[PDB]
Amino acid sequence: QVCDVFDIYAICACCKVESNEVFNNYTFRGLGNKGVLPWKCISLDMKYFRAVTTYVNESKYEKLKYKRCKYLNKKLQNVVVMGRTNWESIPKKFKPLSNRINVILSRTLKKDEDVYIINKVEDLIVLLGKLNYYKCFILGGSVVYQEFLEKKLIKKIYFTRINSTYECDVFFPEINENEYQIISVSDVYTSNNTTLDFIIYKKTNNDDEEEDDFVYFNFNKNSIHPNDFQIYNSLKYKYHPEYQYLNIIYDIMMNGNKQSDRTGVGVLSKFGYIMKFDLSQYFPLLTTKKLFLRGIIEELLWFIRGETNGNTLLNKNVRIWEANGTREFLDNRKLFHREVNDLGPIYGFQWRHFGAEYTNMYDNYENKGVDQLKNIINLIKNDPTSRRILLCAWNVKDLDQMALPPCHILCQFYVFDGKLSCIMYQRSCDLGLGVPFNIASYSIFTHMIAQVCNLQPAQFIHVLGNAHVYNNHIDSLKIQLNRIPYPFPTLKLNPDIKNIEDFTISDFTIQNYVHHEKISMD
Amino acid sequence: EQVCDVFDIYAICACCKVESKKNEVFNNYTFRGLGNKGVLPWKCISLDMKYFRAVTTYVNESKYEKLKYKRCKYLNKEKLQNVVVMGRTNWESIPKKFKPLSNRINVILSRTLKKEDFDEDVYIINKVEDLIVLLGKLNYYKCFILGGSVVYQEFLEKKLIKKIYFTRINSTYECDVFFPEINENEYQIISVSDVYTSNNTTLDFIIYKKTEDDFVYFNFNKEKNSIHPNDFQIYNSLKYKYHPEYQYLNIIYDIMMNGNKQSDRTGVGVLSKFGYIMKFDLSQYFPLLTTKKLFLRGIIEELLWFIRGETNGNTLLNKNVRIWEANGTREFLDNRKLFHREVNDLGPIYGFQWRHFGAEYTNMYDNYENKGVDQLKNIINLIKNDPTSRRILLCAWNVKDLDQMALPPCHILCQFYVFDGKLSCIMYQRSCDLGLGVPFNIASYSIFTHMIAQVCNLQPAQFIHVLGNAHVYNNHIDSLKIQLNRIPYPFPTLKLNPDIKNIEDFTISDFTIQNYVHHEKISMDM
Ligand SMILES: NC(=O)C1=CN([C@@H]2O[C@H](COP(=O)(O)OP(=O)(O)OC[C@H]3O[C@@H](n4cnc5c(N)ncnc54)[C@H](OP(=O)(O)O)[C@@H]3O)[C@@H](O)[C@H]2O)C=CC1
Ligand SMILES: NC(=O)C1=CN([C@@H]2O[C@H](COP(=O)(O)OP(=O)(O)OC[C@H]3O[C@@H](n4cnc5c(N)ncnc54)[C@H](OP(=O)(O)O)[C@@H]3O)[C@@H](O)[C@H]2O)C=CC1
Ligand SMILES: Nc1nc(N)c(-c2cccc(Cl)c2)c(COc2cccc(OCCCC(=O)O)c2)n1
Ligand SMILES: Nc1nc(N)c(-c2cccc(Cl)c2)c(COc2cccc(OCCCC(=O)O)c2)n1
Ligand SMILES: O=c1ccn([C@H]2C[C@H](O)[C@@H](COP(=O)(O)O)O2)c(=O)[nH]1
Ligand SMILES: O=c1ccn([C@H]2C[C@H](O)[C@@H](COP(=O)(O)O)O2)c(=O)[nH]1
């Protein structure tokens, strides 16, 4: 086939377009608006474009030309192909595209030279056949893209997913998932007030003596069916940060220890993982299934007021703590003298009143115990290089009085160069149902603390102690592992809030959340 | 072109330590024992046999034509098996059932015996040069010199070895023949394996050496201190850095190269990073760092004092353990606003939180029996009676008591994990002095894991070290540059007196560190 011989690739940047809402690859399809780009200026895409359409490997060319000659008969640059409309839109100082053989497909133009013009697609394969070039990149225009994809002349699409909405005239054609497959996903980035990532579609099939040393050092190296993780195992580059979560799921399914549970539910378990999410580049809200945050934010606000009254949450239809406050749950816990939905000295109490005698959920605890939360905020503002900036919910004295002992043992904070990072240590991690919400909670918490200390959020670092997958989440997680993440959304806080106690539900906005379908984990 | 590169001649050996401990010096020549009375110095080390088999039988057919090409070129010409070469004494030592070595072309060096003296499928050669002639006329992948001391010695001196695959057997036996002293300018270590236990010894495997476009695109955005670099020449020369000690050393390198400059308490300045995990397999080795000398008497006395629930610094000072001396002084306590604290009364620190969390601290002499929560007793009962519990945590960070402590704990919490009769331990460290504290902290929580495992009738599995604020002191940088260019030794082992059934019944004499091999003392302070 002619795209393998001549190495014809497409490179495009697609934004989202105006009108639950359902998402798919076609979500990202905006190319142009009235002759020009639909977006202001996205310098990381500009930079990826330059490096991709510029890169040549002279050491690799011998093989390309042999192939090209054998198929025909016998300083290195790439070729770049544009439609006339596309060519028009390009400024001036960049106009004869640097270090690239500029080919222009037009039925109207002809002429300068060293800069080629072609009347038909077929007349590109002729020109390719007569040039020394490394690879051929189609820079498009909708029409150019439309016709090259129709003719099956594309080996890979280098597709930038610009995760924001613009007014658009012209759209990338709908890539058929039967003709092309995604093999690679980049890291997620923030450039010019949008997140974005870089994915690669490929056309489907329808002094190395230290290599033996590797084998020698490997001389001593679960009824899951990997063949069911086909999309997951096929991917070459899984750099999207959502793979930190998905890879842990894969590791527990493949290598996890079979253990029984309180009920006899059964888990696969492992011990000790770290995930790190860059809050400067994205908000890490899982995209491989639908996640809701109103509950999560109300829980955090409830913690921050130091509440222990489950009814405050139930009256707002936040039901996270409902099972933990029933008569039966508290009686099983030997809390015979505890009122229904009185969760005892849990998170909120330990954050605002650590060490105070707990009475009931209605008592006035003002100025009682250690206000750890106010203390960690003062340490951050007045002693940011302190290695003592910890918020601890694990009150050993109070554990038996809590509806249950906290899963989220502590937060530690780190300040460098006006930036705030947070470690949270979780003793017990329900990878299928809990951990996704848990990453979102403490990611939101890191933004709130950062903003009230006039700092920028940097990393949220999640340490997993007992890390388990429920045997009844395994089918749902097989489905989830075979979905390709989308670029992450962004979190906006109302910028007016400079005190940790002044946030309300309306101060929080998730932007550009693109996600696959809700999964019922059981 | 060199004969050893055309014909791909390698040596493979296993060397133990030899007969003669207080102020003892170690170097690569520590591991030199090859044999005793015409057999091996040790009974069975089955993992070394497994490794020897895998190296001497492995072939990549799809790389042979390339090697054929090269050999023909050099000689002026146009199932695949390795060759193995043995001295006659070596051959006679091998049990009958193992001869000739299966799936290998067997070659024996002899003058006294000829081919009529052998029943087996073997080539007899009476000089080194006839080996080279033979290799020139055989189809084979690689050639392994399996020794004899006389065979190794004559193949090294003649520069006919491209690499030595060297097993370091970290135990002492009676030897009468020895591997030649390797010349550090002829041969250099390029690679070091994981550390293993086999047949009640630790061992590792080192290698001496004779002295895609899509990937590029996804790295389009690749950008710190680099304010000492390639002072790490040996560190950076190594290809495979698999010894678990590199978990420690690689974090040091990461902090030096990418660390953030910040002030701290003392005002001495550090390089800092946030969030690391190390994991040590206590079933396979005791991770006592070997790139500098460490002593354990003090850290074991500290641990026993923690378990006793003690806060009296004078108890350690009377055993000549000074770990807590500086945090016990009038000036230290007064600068903490502990004006009403007696000298060396460290307040409600680790041992108090482990035995009496929640009790009102009075003084270091009070009897706190049955006050506060005995967390230590609770986790031992949880491990025995509820082993799948996700609540097996021992926590020293008592928020209420922080200001009463000489200083707040660095070692915040231990979480335990039980599967299949093995105990693992995560310890979370809020603040980690990589150059001085962390080496001791690894050894301390590794021993604790052993103690808890034994008293709950479990075997130790992993000690998992989580580092929060991980820092290198600027005054330690030159000392750590030295340490990082040192090649780790196979780790020692830890034995406990097995008669101890209760966490509280341990004493210093119940602990033995065997086969500690290390580089010399470093003063971290210049
Ligand atoms: N987001 C992205 O990655 C990219 C976006 N764009 C945007 O898209 C728009 C440009 O694309 P769109 O309007 O389709 O225009 P195109 O660039 O696809 O241009 C179409 C023109 O190219 C010529 N042409 C097309 N097919 C042939 C053929 N088969 N043989 C000979 N000539 C042919 C004709 O020129 P003639 O008129 O001379 O006959 C045709 O009118 C702009 O808004 C631009 O900024 C462009 C590139 C990439
Ligand atoms: N730990 C380890 O990795 C290893 C240990 N060993 C141990 O080493 C000991 C035996 O080794 P060591 O005593 O040196 O003896 P060797 O195995 O080195 O064999 C020595 C004999 O081989 C013959 N030989 C050597 N070189 C030549 C030559 N260039 N030309 C002709 N013949 C040659 C001679 O045999 P002849 O006298 O018949 O001419 C010589 O006496 C044993 O204890 C064995 O268990 C051996 C290998 C590896
Ligand atoms: N990933 C990706 N794919 C695409 N195909 C396009 C794209 C979009 C429109 C026109 C062109 Cl030529 C390329 C873009 C966006 O980047 C642009 C767009 C328009 C002009 C432009 O300036 C000249 C390039 C200078 C240089 O590379 O040195 C850069 N992104
Ligand atoms: N790393 C390393 N290098 C060495 N050269 C030797 C060695 C030692 C003595 C004789 C020989 Cl042939 C090889 C050893 C230990 O060798 C042993 C010991 C016990 C059994 C053994 O298996 C031989 C048959 C198994 C097989 O290969 O099929 C090999 N270790
Ligand atoms: O914030 C939370 C609270 C709970 N869990 C999950 C982990 C376990 O499945 C269970 C806690 O049960 P124990 O570990 O207390 O037995 O709830 C979380 O993942 N996150
Ligand atoms: O067991 C210990 C005790 C102390 N430190 C080091 C870390 C810090 O450099 C210092 C205490 O730091 P702060 O209290 O200032 O965080 O002691 C350790 O690494 N481990």
Asked if B216 lies within 8 A of A271 by C-beta distance, the reply is no
Q: Which string of DSSP letters, residue by residue, matches B385-453?
A: H-TT-S--EEE---GGGGGGSSS--SEEEEEEEEETTEEEEEEEEEEEETTTHHHHHHHHHHHHHHHHH
8 A C-beta contact, residue A486 and residue A515: yes
In this complex, is the C-beta atom of A397 within 8 Å of any C-beta atom belonging to chain B? yes
Method used to obtain the model: X-ray
List the structure tokens of A28: 């990202």
Query: What's the CA gap between B123 and B109, in Å, rounded?
Result: 9
Whether ligand 3 lies within 6 angstroms of the CB of A224 is answered as no
Q: Which string of DSSP letters, residue by residue, matches B11-52?
A: EEEEEEE----TT----GGGS-EEEBTTB-SSS--HHHHHHH
Nearest CA in chain A to B215: A237
**Using only C-alpha atoms, what is the Rg of chain A?**
28
**Nearest CB neighbour to A387, from listed B60, B214, B469:** B469
Whether ligand 2 lies within 6 angstroms of the CB of B95 is answered as no
In this complex, is the C-beta atom of B124 within 8 Å of any C-beta atom belonging to chain A? no
| DSSP strand pairing (B82-87 vs B104-109) | parallel
Q: Which of A314, A244, A308 is nearest to A276 (CA)?
A: A244
8 A C-beta contact, residue A51 and residue A189: no
In this complex, is the C-beta atom of B268 within 8 Å of any C-beta atom belonging to chain A? no
8 A C-beta contact, residue B35 and residue B93: yes
A124 phi, psi to nearest 5 deg: -85, -45
Exposure class string for A457-466: b at 16+ Cβ within 10 A, else e: bbbbbbbbbb
Asked if A216 lies within 8 A of B205 by C-beta distance, the reply is yes
Nearest CA in chain B to A216: B55
Cis geometry, peptide bond prior to residue B287 (ω within 30 degrees of 0): no
8 A C-beta contact, residue A217 and residue B192: no
Report all structural domains of chain A as residue ranges with CATH numbers, in order of start: 1-204 (3.40.430.10), 207-240 (6.10.250.2210), 241-522 (3.30.572.10)
Residue A467 CA to its chain's centroid (Å) = 21
Asked if B47 lies within 8 A of A260 by C-beta distance, the reply is no
Half-sphere exposure of A406 (CA within 13 A, CB side): 25
Query: What's the CA gap between A433 and A408, in Å, rounded?
Result: 15
Query: What's the CA gap between B221 and B206, in Å, rounded?
Result: 37
Exposure class string for A406-420: b at 16+ Cβ within 10 A, else e: bbbbbbbbbbbeebb
List the structure tokens of A49: 């474009």
8 A C-beta contact, residue B306 and residue B351: yes
List the structure tokens of A434: 């809990």
Instruction: Indicate the residue type of B223.
Output: E
Which ligand has the shortest distance to the CA of A37? 1
Nearest chain A Cα distance for residue B481, angstroms: 25
DSSP state of B489: P
Q: Which of A262, A374, A385 to mutate to test the interface with B (most CBs of B within 10 A)?
A: A385
List the structure tokens of B122: 């073997």
* CA-CA-CA-CA torsion sign (A109, A114, A115, A121): positive
Q: Which of B45, B188, B213, B360 to mutate to test the interface with A (most CBs of A within 10 A)?
A: B213
- Report how far apart the first and last C-alpha atoms of chain B are (Å, whole number): 46
Distance from Cα A86 to the centre of ligand 1, integer Å: 5
8 A C-beta contact, residue B346 and residue B327: yes
- For A101, counting Cβ atoms within 10 Å of its Cβ (0-12 exposed, 13-18 middle, 19+ buried), the class is buried
Whether ligand 3 lies within 6 angstroms of the CB of A46 is answered as yes
The Cα-based distances of B172 to B30, B33, B41 in angstroms read 10, 8, 9
DSSP state of B384: H
Asked if B430 lies within 8 A of A390 by C-beta distance, the reply is yes
Query: What's the CA gap between A419 and A445, in Å, rounded?
Result: 14
- Report how far apart the first and last C-alpha atoms of chain A are (Å, whole number): 46
**Nearest CB neighbour to A217, from listed B242, B276, B431:** B242
Query: What's the CA gap between A8 and A125, in Å, rounded?
Result: 10
Whether ligand 5 lies within 6 angstroms of the CB of A438 is answered as yes
The Cα-based distances of A512 to A187, A491, A508 in angstroms read 17, 9, 14
* Residue A24, number of CB atoms within 10 A of its CB: 11
Is A150 annotated as contributing to ligand binding?
Answer: no
Q: Which of A139, A125, A437, A164 is nearest to A295 (CA)?
A: A437
8 A C-beta contact, residue A140 and residue A12: yes
In this complex, is the C-beta atom of B264 within 8 Å of any C-beta atom belonging to chain A? yes
In sequence order, what are the beta bridge partners of B109? B87, B125
- Nearest atom in ligand 3 to the alpha carbon of residue A160 is 1
Which ligand has the shortest distance to the CA of A45? 3
Q: Which of B57, B44, B43 is nearest to B12 (CA)?
A: B57
DSSP state of B366: S
Whether ligand 1 lies within 6 angstroms of the CB of A83 is answered as yes
Q: Which of residues 273-302 of A touch B (CB under 8 A)?
A: 273-274, 276
Residue tagged 């389009």 (tokens): B220
In sequence order, what are the beta bridge partners of A277? A460
Residue tagged 């390795």 (tokens): B82
- Nearest atom in ligand 2 to the alpha carbon of residue B176 is 43
Q: Which of B217, B240, B243, B464 to mutate to test the interface with A (most CBs of A within 10 A)?
A: B217
Q: How would you write A418-483 as a 3-class SS string? A: CEEEEEEEEEEEECCCHHHHHHHHHHHHHHHHHHHCCCEEEEEEEEEEEEEEEHHHHHHHHHHHCC
In this complex, is the C-beta atom of B224 within 8 Å of any C-beta atom belonging to chain A? no
DSSP state of A122: H
List the structure tokens of B317: 């000072």
Instruction: Indicate the residue type of B299.
Output: I
Helix orientation angle between B437-455 and B375-385, rounded to the nearest 10 degrees: 50
Q: Which of B193, B314, B317, B285 is nearest to B246 (CA)?
A: B193
All residues at 6 or more sequence positions from A213 whose CB lies less than 8 Å from its CB, including other chains:
B190, B191, B207, B239, B240
- Nearest atom in ligand 2 to the alpha carbon of residue B127 is 30
8 A C-beta contact, residue B513 and residue B295: no
Residue tagged 């910028």 (tokens): A495
Resolution (A): 2.1
The Cα-based distances of B227 to B478, B480, B506 in angstroms read 12, 14, 47
Q: Which of A415, A508, A412 is nearest to A461 (CA)?
A: A412
* Residue A222, number of CB atoms within 10 A of its CB: 11
8 A C-beta contact, residue A350 and residue A395: yes
8 A C-beta contact, residue B426 and residue B414: yes
Query: What's the CA gap between A453 and A500, in Å, rounded?
Result: 9
Asked if B275 lies within 8 A of A461 by C-beta distance, the reply is yes
